[PDB]
Design a protein around this nucleic acid. Sequence first.
RNA 1: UUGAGUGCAGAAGAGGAGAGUGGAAUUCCAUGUGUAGCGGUGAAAUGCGUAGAUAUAUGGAGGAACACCAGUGGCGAAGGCGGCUCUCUGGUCUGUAACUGACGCUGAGGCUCGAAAGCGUGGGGAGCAAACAGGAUUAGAUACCCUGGUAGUCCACGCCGUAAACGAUGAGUGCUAAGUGUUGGAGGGUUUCCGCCCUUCAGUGCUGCAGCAAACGCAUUAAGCACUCCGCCUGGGGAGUACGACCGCAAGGUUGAAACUCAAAGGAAUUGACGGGGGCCCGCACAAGCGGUGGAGCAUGUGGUUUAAUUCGAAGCAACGC
Lengths: 66, 154, 117
Amino acid sequence: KVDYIAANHIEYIDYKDTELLKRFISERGKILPRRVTGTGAKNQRKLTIAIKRARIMGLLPFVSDE
Amino acid sequence: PRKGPVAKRDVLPDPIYNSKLVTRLINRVMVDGKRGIAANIIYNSFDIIKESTGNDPLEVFEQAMKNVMPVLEVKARRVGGSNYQVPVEVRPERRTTLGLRWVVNYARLRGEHTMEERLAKEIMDAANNTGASVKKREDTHKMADANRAFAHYR
Amino acid sequence: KKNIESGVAHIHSTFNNTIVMITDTHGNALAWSSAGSLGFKGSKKSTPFAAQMAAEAATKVAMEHGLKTVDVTVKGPGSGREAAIRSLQATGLEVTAIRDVTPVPHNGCRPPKRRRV
RNA sequence: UUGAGUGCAGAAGAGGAGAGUGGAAUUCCAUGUGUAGCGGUGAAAUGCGUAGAUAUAUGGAGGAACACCAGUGGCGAAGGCGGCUCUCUGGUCUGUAACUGACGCUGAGGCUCGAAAGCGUGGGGAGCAAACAGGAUUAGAUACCCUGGUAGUCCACGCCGUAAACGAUGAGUGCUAAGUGUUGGAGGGUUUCCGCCCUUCAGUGCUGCAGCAAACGCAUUAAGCACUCCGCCUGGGGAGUACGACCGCAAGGUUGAAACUCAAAGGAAUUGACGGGGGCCCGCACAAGCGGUGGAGCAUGUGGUUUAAUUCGAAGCAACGC
């Protein structure tokens, strides 16, 4: 009833893909639940570890109110 | 009341002026059905208007319906017990009720030393923008959109 | 004085009192009106009716110093936070930015207890 | 060689120890702006502020917890484990099946691990908060409400060995209708399936046959059908108390009676019953209205005093022009 995210057979989240980064987070700065996109369960964990490394170097802001 | 709605008993016009709302103004000062004193001195007061700054009593009665007219109304509709209300759109039934109650119960508040000069100056005030019943319309305009601080979660 | 006319307002409103303060661009403080300062006391300061006239008495002394445009800083989850802004535009200003900055932690400290009533 | 273990190929996991590190929030400090309040309650009070707060902006200091994903989701033998990175390291599951050839199960004693609170020694202390102080409510309040605030909560090393450590269901193994999701695999087909179907191994939920059950219910994740090994019970109090012994610095823990009473104590269900629950359903019960009481005086009835007696009863609704 909802499509997945690996139609392009993405293998490794690769810590740096800032364009694939933006499909999932909120515009305010949070993470959308897995009920929304219907994505994979292990891929949810991959995304979570990925963007948590992303917030530490500063390739995404923690809190974006402006 | 609790079961459902109820009728309102609209009033008949006068066989002299031929106007319905004049009868509504008659039937708010009259105590114990004494039409002989109160209604006749209301006739006398509108003839005082006719004799000084006026031509016909029906037109100046409509002029009083101008300058007293309640444009808005609130009603205390609590939910959780607190002071909760909103400026509701007034029915022309309840518009006439509020405006003529302003006029009559300010003729009570006026209390001048002649039993119809209080009525004469009362309707010279309510027909010609003066008196505190027209200022009661002013103060009704005041609290309209002044209790609106708690009347926008509706 | 100096007629900056590009100010920053501030909104803070608990369950029991509210304070509005209008400052400079940064802002250094200019004029402020409190719901306690307007004669109200005790428990009635929670109501949104105070938020109108507190905003009005803030804006009068504000635009005595000359004030056209403004920023809207919103703290303090309470009751009349919207009524304060809506009466703020009603005395002639330039509200065009709505930021409801409510400072939420990330589980740092502990809250107080329940109220066993 | 089927039970059990070692290959080899693979998969998931908040499984554990050590070492570093990230941002937001709360508080303290430094400074700029600003004057007369901040704060709390059912309401108020104590408190803090004119030695300039509360408010706002910038910067520093410090300790603890890791916002959203997060889900009858995952991992562990039970207590339990959630920010990120590196080193060391334990287990589980699937496929294969050249190899070993019954090597298994359970375990009185024994040994190890063991939430929270606690003790000792040495560091640390932002919040929160037993005791304690003050304010108020109360007939009384060494309580519940509010303002403060220590030991503790944290870290390192020992000590203690307790809970509703509950699924109130010991463990190993085999058999007995089904439907339904979900976590992790492997295999076959249409199909680029990673967008479907079909089958199977391992957990985790929900509904439901036979059967068991006093009822409630349970029901391939048995509280059915059976074997093996352990643990415990035999009316209610006195009582997990007394005495003795062992462990502990201490608090305490483990083991564990009788004299003397009573004819009951207990589980489940049935009829009136509460919900600070509503579907209702109404009603001058409200909201909307008018008029009246409570004002002044007069009359009446009652309580009261006085009385030679002020002669009975009436006593919220449902007694006082009875």
